[PDB]
Design a protein around this ligand. Sequence first.
Ligand code: VGH
Length: 285
Amino acid sequence: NPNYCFAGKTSSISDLKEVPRKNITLIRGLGAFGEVYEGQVPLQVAVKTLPEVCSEQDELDFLMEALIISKFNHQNIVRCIGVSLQSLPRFILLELMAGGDLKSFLRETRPRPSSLAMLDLLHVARDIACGCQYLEENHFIHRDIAARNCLLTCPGPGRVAKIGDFGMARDIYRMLPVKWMPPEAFMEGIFTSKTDTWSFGVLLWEIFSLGYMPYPSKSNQEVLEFVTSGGRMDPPKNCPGPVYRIMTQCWQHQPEDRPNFAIILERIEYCTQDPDVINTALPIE
Ligand SMILES: C[C@@H](Oc1cc(-c2cnn(C3CCNCC3)c2)cnc1N)c1c(Cl)ccc(F)c1Cl
């Protein structure tokens, strides 16, 4: 059985809490390689399934993501409730995030011409940055920080954003998101904590653009050449200067010139304190 190392000692498949299949009930689909369901164990859960028709490498990938998520302990990273691996199809059981993924939420919750404010966006940003800081200080590199991989606890004002998907980190541990990647990453395949800083800047743009695809109207190859030549995205519509400034710092060409997540968090905090930032109106389509 596969071994995993994080924050120190090794984890084993046996360390995962196996939940008896009889205890698990699927309620509804929630929408990649495999399905996701709302489920009950009563404890309400999200159930990630492995296709019975998969390769042996698929099997290990699935097991590896369970190990990875199960070893984190932070409020801004989605909890793993357990697994059901001794029956087919195999399940990973996650904390149910009723708000859904962040990209869909932003697109569905955009201010209507007939609600959401700057402070709400800043709190999402802060939530994920806190998650990233935790990963950084535990020397884990996510490799794919993006709005599609973040989840929300609920739609309303009490929402908490968390990092939810670790498929890219899992793959590399043993289709590329080049629009989220720094030059040294897509050119050299070099990944560090500063890799995630760059990607967080792109996530910030996603958040304050309210769910636009990065580098609108550009293809992957065009972005590659654009970014390699020093090109950077313009501010999202109505974006406050202090927020754009965080983005452009995250996108410094040299990794050593980019902020670590402690610094990012401080600057996000300073933004939430600035009335000229949070009183700024979001654009309405
Ligand atoms: C694996 C899957 O897990 C969940 C999906 C969801 C989810 C997706 N969509 N929805 C909708 C349910 C109906 N109301 C709107 C959100 C909830 C909630 N919690 C999860 N743990 C998931 C998905 Cl599908 C997308 C991004 C992620 F980062 C993750 Cl981790």
